[PDB]
């Protein structure tokens, strides 16, 4: 099981000094492809929001967060702010996936596809597991059906592997739903 995006809890503080023997300890929940990039973004946010630089700061702890039950489907809501070609905007989106990592990957892909927003232009404000009744988007609410039933409208025809691939076939494919 490999996820492109991982969730980390990064803990850090400003370097102790004479004035502050025990400086405030700050924690963040961040998304990054690696722990190194997670720490980089943690220090970026600490510098921008608390005036604590990496040079005069201390790294305390970093742990990965894994989905409790990756075997079941959940509804995930993501509150984010992104930058467009003309300014900044806030955005709330909903996704269905077995893990929040998959939901975040879907969020990045959808932002790229629909708004041409690159990964570095997106800040995640909040994440949460939404119950079915509290979902706001029709896209997620359409699969909240006890008896869900539909045919496979679009299926791509291919051999099990390229071993059986042939340029020529005697008959055209026979497709039906």
């Amino acid at each position: 099981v490999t996820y492109k995006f991982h969730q980390y809890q990064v803990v850090g503080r400003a370097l102790p000094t004479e004035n502050d023997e025990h400086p405030k300890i700050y924690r963040m929940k961040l998304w990054a492809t690696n722990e190194v990039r997670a720490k980089s973004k943690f220090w970026y946010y600490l510098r921008k929001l608390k005036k604590v630089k990496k040079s005069n700061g201390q790294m305390l702890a970093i742990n990965e967060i894994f989905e409790k039950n990756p075997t079941k489907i959940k509804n995930y809501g993501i509150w984010l702010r992104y930058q467009s070609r003309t300014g900044y905007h806030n955005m709330y989106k909903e996704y269905r996936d077995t893990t929040l990592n998959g939901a975040v990957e879907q969020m990045y892909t959808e932002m790229a596809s629909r708004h041409r927003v690159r990964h570095h232009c997106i800040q995640i404000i909040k994440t949460a597991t939404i119950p079915a009744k509290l979902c706001k988007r029709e896209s997620t609410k359409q699969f909240h059906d006890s008896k869900i039933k539909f045919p496979l409208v679009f299926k791509k025809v291919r051999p099990p592997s390229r071993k059986l691939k042939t340029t020529y076939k005697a008959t055209r494919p026979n497709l039906f739903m």
Partner: protein, 130 residues
């Protein structure tokens, strides 16, 4: 129309990837592109619909059932025997058997096929002349 649908309890064949040839049961639907599948010998996980071929078999289960419940439902529906006896299911087994034949077995099969072809040709000629 639409003899087959994706449904809770629908049995599907994995038609692509490392899991090709395996039967799975659709126990939930994530979205239009992927569902939650399960089977006795795997861990319930998601799979894209593009890698699934729906079969004519369906079992009576509730969504995301327990492993024991799913196994009991599959046994009651006799999914394995029904799939194996069907021509579609028998096709994969016959392909595997043909791939597994050895040189001496291939020679014996060739002899049997030649004899059958000769006898059938004689029989057909007699029928035509009749």
């Amino acid at each position: 129309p639409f003899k087959r649908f994706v449904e809770i309890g629908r049995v599907a064949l994995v038609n692509y990837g490392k899991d090709y040839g395996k039967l799975v049961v659709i126990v939930d639907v994530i979205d239009q592109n992927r569902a939650l599948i399960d089977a006795p010998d795997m861990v319930r996980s998601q799979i894209n619909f593009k890698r699934l071929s729906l079969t004519d078999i369906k079992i009576d289960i509730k969504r995301i059932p327990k492993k024991k419940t799913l196994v009991a439902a599959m046994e009651a529906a006799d999914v394995k025997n029904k799939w194996e006896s069907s021509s579609w299911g028998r096709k994969l087994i016959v392909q595997k058997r043909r791939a597994s034949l050895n040189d001496f077995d291939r020679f014996k099969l060739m002899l049997a096929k030649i004899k059958r072809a000769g006898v059938v040709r004689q029989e057909l000629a007699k029928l035509k002349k009749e």
